[PDB]
């Protein structure tokens, strides 16, 4: 039951069904007690029955509607579990990661498969908490809440902060994703090399694993929080470790377009 705008309120459709049941259930009790003419008792018991269906599953027998506005099936608990896209259903379309990022990619020719160019500006938000603490370990800030306000505005960052982040990212690695993640190599781990600007420097050899051209394809970026997730991520998920495809014993770090032409 929530306050929207001006005073609009939003409530899970389930509540209009619940009221259905309760009212009917009560009206029943009162109809039993008042005195009871058979037709009316059943009549009600029928309504009651239907109602009990409604919350559980709507549409198996007729379809309940909120009053004239939307001839829409009030989502029944069933519809909740199943639905066009409901409970176990969208439980798999995806959820939104907390330490994520996404920008445009651009070829990083000097970059080694090992690493990837990540915008410092992006790195900052992404590794914010890892930075905060690091700020406190140095003189840049007295405490967390301090370190936070210290970074709440762009004009207030001392160049000392970059040196902190640059120190926080020392040997950690991130994951980069592509538009259709078709195979496991559709997500690979690299060591970030912070850089200026907006674009994300990607290596050319791995451009074959992810089907990525540079006309604007934007890659996302995720962060391994646990020491474990990090252990697995740079040990068995790092780009330079997965060179041969899982489909064919043929390499996928093959010299793509320009390298051949050169060689």
């Amino acid at each position: 039951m929530v306050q929207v705008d001006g005073g609009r309120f939003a409530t899970s459709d389930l509540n209009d069904l619940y009221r259905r049941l309760i009212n009917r259930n009560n009206r029943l009790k009162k109809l039993l007690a008042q005195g009871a003419p058979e037709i009316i008792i059943r009549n009600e018991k029928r309504m009651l029955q239907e109602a009990v269906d409604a919350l559980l599953d709507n549409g198996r027998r007729g379809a309940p509607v909120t009053n004239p506005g939307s001839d829409r099936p009030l989502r029944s608990l069933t519809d909740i579990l199943s639905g066009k896209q409901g409970r176990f259903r969208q439980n798999l379309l995806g959820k939104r990661v907390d330490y994520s990022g996404r920008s445009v990619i651009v070829v990083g020719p000097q970059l080694k498969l090992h690493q990837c160019g990540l915008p410092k500006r992006m790195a900052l938000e992404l590794f914010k908490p890892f930075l905060l603490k690091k700020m406190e370990e140095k003189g840049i800030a007295p405490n967390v809440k301090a370190a936070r306000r210290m970074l709440e505005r762009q004009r207030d960052i001392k160049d000392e902060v970059w040196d902190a982040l640059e120190e926080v990212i020392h040997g950690k690695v991130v994951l980069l994703n592509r538009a259709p993640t078709l195979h496991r190599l559709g997500i690979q781990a690299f060591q970030p090399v912070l850089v200026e600007g907006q674009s994300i420097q990607l290596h050319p050899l791995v451009c074959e694993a992810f089907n990525a051209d540079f006309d604007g394809d934007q890659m996302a970026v995720h962060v391994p929080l646990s020491s474990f997730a990090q252990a697995e991520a740079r040990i068995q998920m790092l780009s330079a470790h997965n060179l041969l495809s899982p489909a064919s014993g043929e390499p996928l770090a093959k010299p793509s377009r320009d390298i051949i032409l050169g060689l």
Binding site: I39, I40, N43, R46, G62
Partner: peptide, 12 residues
Amino acid sequence: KISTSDPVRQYL
């Protein structure tokens, strides 16, 4: 089947 008709018929 559909509820209104049944009760109507029922008491009518």
